[PDB]
Amino acid sequence: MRWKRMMQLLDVHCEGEIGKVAIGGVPKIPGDTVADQLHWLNTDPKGRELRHFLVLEPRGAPIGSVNLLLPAKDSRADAAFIILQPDQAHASSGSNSICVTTALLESGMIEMQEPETVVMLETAAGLVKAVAQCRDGHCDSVTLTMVPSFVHELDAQIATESWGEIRFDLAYGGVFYALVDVRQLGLTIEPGNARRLVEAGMLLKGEINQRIQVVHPDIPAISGVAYVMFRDEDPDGAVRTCTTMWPGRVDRSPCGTGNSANLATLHARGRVKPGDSFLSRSIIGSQFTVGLQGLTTVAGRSAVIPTITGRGFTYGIHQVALDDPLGGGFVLTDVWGAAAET
Amino acid sequence: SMRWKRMMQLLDVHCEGEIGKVAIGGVPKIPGDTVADQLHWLNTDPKGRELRHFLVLEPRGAPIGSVNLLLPAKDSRADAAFIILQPDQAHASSGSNSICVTTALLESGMIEMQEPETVVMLETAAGLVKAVAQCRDGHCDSVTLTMVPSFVHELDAQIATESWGEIRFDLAYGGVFYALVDVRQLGLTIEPGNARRLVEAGMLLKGEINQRIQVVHPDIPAISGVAYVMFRDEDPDGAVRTCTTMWPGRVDRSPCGTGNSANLATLHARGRVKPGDSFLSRSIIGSQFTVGLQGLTTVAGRSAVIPTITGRGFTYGIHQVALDAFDPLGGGFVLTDVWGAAAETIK
Numbered sequence: 263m264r265w266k267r268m269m270q271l272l273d274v275h276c277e278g279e280i281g282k283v284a285i286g287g288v289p290k291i292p293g294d295t296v297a298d299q300l301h302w303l304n305t306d307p308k309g310r311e312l313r314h315f316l317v318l319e320p321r322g323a324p325i326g327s328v329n330l331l332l333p334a335k336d337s338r339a340d341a342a343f344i345i346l347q348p349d350q351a352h353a354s355s356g357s358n359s360i361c362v363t364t365a366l367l368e369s370g371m372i373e374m375q376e377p378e379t380v381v382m383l384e385t386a387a388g389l390v391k392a393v394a395q396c397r398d399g400h401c402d403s404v405t406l407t408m409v410p411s412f413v414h415e416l417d418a419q420i421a422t423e424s425w426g427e428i429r430f431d432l433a434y435g436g437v438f439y440a441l442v443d444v445r446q447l448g449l450t451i452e453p454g455n456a457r458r459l460v461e462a463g464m465l466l467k468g469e470i471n472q473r474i475q476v477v478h479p480d481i482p483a484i485s486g487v488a489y490v491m492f493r494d495e496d497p498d499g500a501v502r503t504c505t506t507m508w509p510g511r512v513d514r515s516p517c518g519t520g521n522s523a524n525l526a527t528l529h530a531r532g533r534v535k536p537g538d539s540f541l542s543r544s545i546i547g548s549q550f551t552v553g554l555q556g557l558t559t560v561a562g563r564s565a566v567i568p569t570i571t572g573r574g575f576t577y578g579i580h581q582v583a584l585d586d587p588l589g590g591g592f593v594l595t596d597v598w599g600a601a602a603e604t
Numbered sequence: 605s606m607r608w609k610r611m612m613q614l615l616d617v618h619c620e621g622e623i624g625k626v627a628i629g630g631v632p633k634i635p636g637d638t639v640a641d642q643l644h645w646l647n648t649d650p651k652g653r654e655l656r657h658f659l660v661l662e663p664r665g666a667p668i669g670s671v672n673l674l675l676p677a678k679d680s681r682a683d684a685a686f687i688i689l690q691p692d693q694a695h696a697s698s699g700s701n702s703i704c705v706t707t708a709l710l711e712s713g714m715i716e717m718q719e720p721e722t723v724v725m726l727e728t729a730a731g732l733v734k735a736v737a738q739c740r741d742g743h744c745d746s747v748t749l750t751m752v753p754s755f756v757h758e759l760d761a762q763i764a765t766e767s768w769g770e771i772r773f774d775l776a777y778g779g780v781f782y783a784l785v786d787v788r789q790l791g792l793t794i795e796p797g798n799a800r801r802l803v804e805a806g807m808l809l810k811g812e813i814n815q816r817i818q819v820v821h822p823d824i825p826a827i828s829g830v831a832y833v834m835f836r837d838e839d840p841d842g843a844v845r846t847c848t849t850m851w852p853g854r855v856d857r858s859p860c861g862t863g864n865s866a867n868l869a870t871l872h873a874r875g876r877v878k879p880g881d882s883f884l885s886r887s888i889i890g891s892q893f894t895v896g897l898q899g900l901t902t903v904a905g906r907s908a909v910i911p912t913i914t915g916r917g918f919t920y921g922i923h924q925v926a927l928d929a930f931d932p933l934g935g936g937f938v939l940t941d942v943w944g945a946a947a948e949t950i951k
């Protein structure tokens with residue numbers, strides 16, 4: 263007897279970026295803290311197997327994340343979650359935090375109050391406050407208060423064959439970013455350059471992670487440069503972003519965590535102060551509002567408290583049988599990218 | 605008006621790794637007096653494109669897989685009808701998707717499952733496809749299709765190319781039209797490491813071949829154009845190795861039923877198979893079909909073959925989609941990063 267054990271997922275997107283939210287049938291993930299759960303997912307073969315089942319073919323596709331809803335361990339939190347992608351499990355994500363909030367409210371798992379509901383999400387990076395503007399059972403907007411974000415290294419350099427010396431910032435916005443001014447590559451962040459930006463982003467991610475090891479100073483489970491995010495500024499002042507994601511695709515959203523990491527660099531450079539906000543646009547022109555709420559410190563260095571505002575849209579529901587002659591999960595380089603061959 | 609539109613229910617199935625979602629609920633009326641007319645409508649009317657894009661482009665759809673639209677049978681001999689939706693167009697035929705549809709109908713109980721065997725007669729725009737399903741303990745373990753009459757359009761065509769010199773290929777029909785290309789001419793083999801190169805080559809050739817020749821089924825005006833370029837080879841053990849390339853740029857994970865059907869028509873024309881023969885075919889990922897030649901017939905007064913294609917389907921989930929009045933991306937979209945360079949032209 264099959265279809266005895268089903269996982270139920272709500273299909274949601276935030277400004278174009280898919281965040282499936284697994285709400286029922288999520289297995290127990292070992293670990294005493296959510297950070298330990300993240301570590302286990304990224305180091306235990308059973309966690310890899312679980313992630314691959316959910317995110318590789320035939321159940322998964324190159325675009326989108328699977329958010330595992332997990333029990334809150336912190337009494338202040340309404341729920342916990344970890345983000346699954348084809349590269350690894352990740353601690354944090356703006357677009358996916360909005361998807362989870364949207365899903366929790368629109369499914370009735372959390373009481374929806376109008377005109378505003380506060381949802382406290384627990385991540386491996388810390389608590390993320392999600393303030394939802396609600397109307398008629400609809401979650402219209404969500405503003406996240408992201409985890410304390412900081413600069414790791416400003417103005418780093420790396421030599422490359424195609425562009426010569428590339429300057430970039432290494433910064434933390436819930437995961438670690440290499441932040442790269444795109445004009446250095448002689449490219450603009452526009453749909454026609456998506457393939458070229460992916461190839462550049464992957465080259466850079468691979469090289470940077472070979473040269474330097476980064477870890478959160480208080481949270482050992484968060485390590486490595488997750489993504490290279492290309493950045494520019496539009497004529498009207500908006501921050502244009504293109505987060506590249508292994509094994510080779512771009513974030514459809516303006517990227518919450520990448521904007522948080524970038525905000526830490528803007529503050530370090532004297533270009534923003536608390537109370538400031540601005541727009542960020544993705545490669546497809548979708549938009550977030552990015553705010554600087556205030557300052558804090560992380561392990562002795564200056565840090566920022568970012569806010570990220572965007573909208574989630576529920577577009578369906580999936581039931582996946584957990585209990586096939588392929589089965590495990592597979593990829594091919596045709597749509598997953600050259601790097602997928604690994 | 606109403607907040608919610610296009611509420612549809614789909615079974616998630618794959619055949620030897622190739623995804624074929626099957627729409628079993630909320631399917632709207634598709635105009636047309638015949639299934640071929642429905643296919644024409646899907647490929648010509650703005651509302652047909654809207655529906656297809658809704659179902660197959662982001663966020664609801666992804667580069668891999670088809671959506672099979674189950675439709676009311678119009679032929680009284682058929683149990684169900686369907687049309688295949690992909691990011692390039694709607695298509696008349698597909699072996700892997702016929703097996704998905706058969707599997708989904710039986711395993712869901714929408715058609716009563718008989719054991720050890722159930723016969724499901726499927727109507728497509730190309731004609732009736734007999735699906736014989738071996739069924740055991742509530743599961744559809746394998747399906748053998750009797751494909752539509754398949755034939756050669758042109759043998760030994762050639763085309764000049766920058767990278768490969770003169771490429772020899774056959775144009776043939778196996779439910780849709782193929783350009784069939786011996787892969788060794790590219791200096792490549794069909795293996796996962798070459799997937800991206802095969803896609804690029806297949807896309808280049810599809811584009812060039814279609815601007816140079818117009819092909820239409822002689823009895824069915826709605827079936828036109830070269831749908832796919834399928835690279836082919838022969839494994840040491842005699843199996844036919846295939847890699848069907850699909851616009852805007854990916855490979856079939858299955859050995860390809862329609863492509864093997866087209867190829868079978870060329871094998872018969874070259875005197876290399878006779879009725880009763882069968883052989884394996886393998887895809888780029890090593891999944892397998894059994895290909896048989898049942899018999900001979902004619903199309904347009906010229907020789908044609910009746911292929912059989914045997915493979916397995918696997919149901920692995922179910923889902924629902926809807927269209928929220930509030931959603932600004934309800935139309936569907938693509939980006940070249942994972943859909944392919946050619947995706948830039950999808951308006």
Ligand SMILES: O=C(O)[C@@H]1C[C@@H](O)CN1
Binds near residue numbers: 622698700858860863
């Ligand atoms: O088996 C076949 O005929 C099909 C052709 C494409 O629909 C994908 N596989």
